[PDB]
Amino acid sequence: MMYIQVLGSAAGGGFPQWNCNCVNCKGYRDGTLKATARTQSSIALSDDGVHWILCNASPDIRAQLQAFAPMQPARALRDTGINAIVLLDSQIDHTTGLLSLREGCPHQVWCTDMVHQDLTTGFPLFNMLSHWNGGLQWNRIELEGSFVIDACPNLKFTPFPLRSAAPPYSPHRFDPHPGDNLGLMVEDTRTGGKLFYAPGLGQVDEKLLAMMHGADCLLVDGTLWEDDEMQRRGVGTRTGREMGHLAQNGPGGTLEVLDGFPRQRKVLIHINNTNPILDENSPERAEVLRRGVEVAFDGMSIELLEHHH
Amino acid sequence: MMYIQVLGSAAGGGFPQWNCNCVNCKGYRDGTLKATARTQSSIALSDDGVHWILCNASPDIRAQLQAFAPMQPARALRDTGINAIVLLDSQIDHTTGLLSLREGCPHQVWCTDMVHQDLTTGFPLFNMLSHWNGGLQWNRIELEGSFVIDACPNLKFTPFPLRSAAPPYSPHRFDPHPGDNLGLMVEDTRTGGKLFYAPGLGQVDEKLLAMMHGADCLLVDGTLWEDDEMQRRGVGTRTGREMGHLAQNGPGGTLEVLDGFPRQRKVLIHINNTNPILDENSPERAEVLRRGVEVAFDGMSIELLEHHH
Ligand SMILES: [Mn+2]
Numbered sequence A, B: 001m002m003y004i005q006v007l008g009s010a011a012g013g014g015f016p017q018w019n020c021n022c023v024n025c026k027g028y029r030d031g032t033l034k035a036t037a038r039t040q041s042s043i044a045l046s047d048d049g050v051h052w053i054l055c056n057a058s059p060d061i062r063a064q065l066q067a068f069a070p071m072q073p074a075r076a077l078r079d080t081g082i083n084a085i086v087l088l089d090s091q092i093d094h095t096t097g098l099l100s101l102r103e104g105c106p107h108q109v110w111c112t113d114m115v116h117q118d119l120t121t122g123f124p125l126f127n128m129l130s131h132w133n134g135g136l137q138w139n140r141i142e143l144e145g146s147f148v149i150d151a152c153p154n155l156k157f158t159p160f161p162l163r164s165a166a167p168p169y170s171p172h173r174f175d176p177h178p179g180d181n182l183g184l185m186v187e188d189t190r191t192g193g194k195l196f197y198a199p200g201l202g203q204v205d206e207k208l209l210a211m212m213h214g215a216d217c218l219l220v221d222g223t224l225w226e227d228d229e230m231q232r233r234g235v236g237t238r239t240g241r242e243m244g245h246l247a248q249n250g251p252g253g254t255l256e257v258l259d260g261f262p263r264q265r266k267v268l269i270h271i272n273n274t275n276p277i278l279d280e281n282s283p284e285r286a287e288v289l290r291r292g293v294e295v296a297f298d299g300m301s302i303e304l305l306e307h308h309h
């Protein structure tokens, strides 16, 4: 079995977002919206249910670990079910949780050279945390080939660089490089079962599509329903294209893309607080369901048992 | 009225702590301990109930704001009840929450030159956050005199430097300076009512004691019951003295100190997960109660109406 646990399913800011009173956030607080609160984007993976690899360490990590019992196996006075961390980018919503793991260093952290550069300069987590019992031990994710983390020896990870959209603090946001952003294929090598995980997806091409057809489950960017959602909700002016996100709806959107993948389990994750698919009663949620696409929620468990071929 | 809201009452790591299986943390998880979960040290202050000053921005800030309704007055599509932030030190447990307020910049942040130096070098929040709509606007806390934040014009803040115990990442942890750590007197200038707040207190002297006698409520470091608590619980080797904390019990401890203050309301805050006072049934909790000392909990409201003289 490959076990996938969704710790957090929201985009940056979570749901509801602390400073937002958009129709969803305010509707949630007022008790009029049928929706469930979500913490920030993060999943955990395991090949045995005991040793876990954390993919992205969100600012909500304390609440996320608390909610998932295998995160505390209680085998010793100090213990954790996290055996390694993999980072897919250097965004604040995917890295700030490392600060909350300071009491448990050293930790093995896998990330690209690009991300390690951000996390030793602009957001210098590797430098800061080194003062807590050795801190973060960097394992380089190369831009080709695959890697296996010893704690989960049956999971083989193959990174795929995606279009670079480095965070605003990055000494190179204006000068994007391959390795700023990854999607990950993860294979259980006992069964061939494969997960493709890309919480940020701003572009697809034929190479990416072909590689995705090899997957059994696609767990992909669900940030916005429409490219101009933030303007429609009155909560800003950024578009999906500016932020590196393919919206669900419209030409070139992810629902059009996912139409090419009938055999795969398809799950949207990293959903912004503005996205109507969070409202369980919306026509947008009904449309995703009609298309065989699921909307990730906190605490969702995905089990991959086998490969489709 | 001066309104004091306890957002978080635990020391670093919170309660239970994510990687800890000490008698308290494991007893809480097992359901055998009568105790309440706590997020990391933070309070909010107001003179009117509408405009709030956040003192320390903890890693748990999202959950803390969510739990306290005046933090979201819903006056516009983007809004917050936080009108300014005051930092008493540059520790990770008092500053990491600023990253979670990125969507609402600019913010007015008050801190000493010492703390601003840490937060522009070793943990460069001021630099990072400047890329989110202007980021954090520094207002210098001088080491003498007082300051008033315009949003709460009836609250007068008077800092008192405490013994310096800079965080492990600080380019000057080995070279301590006045201004690394503050306690704060806050006066409602309509009534003379005064709060003294010192979540980290590693030393008292006559000057500090005299100034404390002017307060109506003392809200002070409750980290450890005994100086060697972490060793007693088997979860490490650090002592209170090494960490800059006066333990409750023993000579020179805070209960002995607080005995000198019979007229004041006395509340312990920043309580470590190991501290037996978290167990509502412990002899230690019974002793604090016998002494007229309260144990802060998340969501505790303290109202100061008047001054004792
Ligand atoms: Mn994001």
Ligand SMILES: [Mn+2]
Pocket: B011, B012, B091, B093, B270
């Ligand atoms: Mn602390």
Ligand code: NA
Pocket: A011, A012, A013, A014, A272, A273
């Ligand atoms: Na967002």
Ligand code: NA
Pocket: B011, B012, B013, B014, B272, B273
């Ligand atoms: Na602690």
Ligand SMILES: [Zn+2]
Pocket: A016, A017, A020, A021, A022, A023, A024, A025, A026, A273, A274
């Ligand atoms: Zn919203």
Ligand SMILES: [Zn+2]
Pocket: B016, B017, B020, B021, B022, B023, B024, B025, B026, B273, B274
């Ligand atoms: Zn504990």
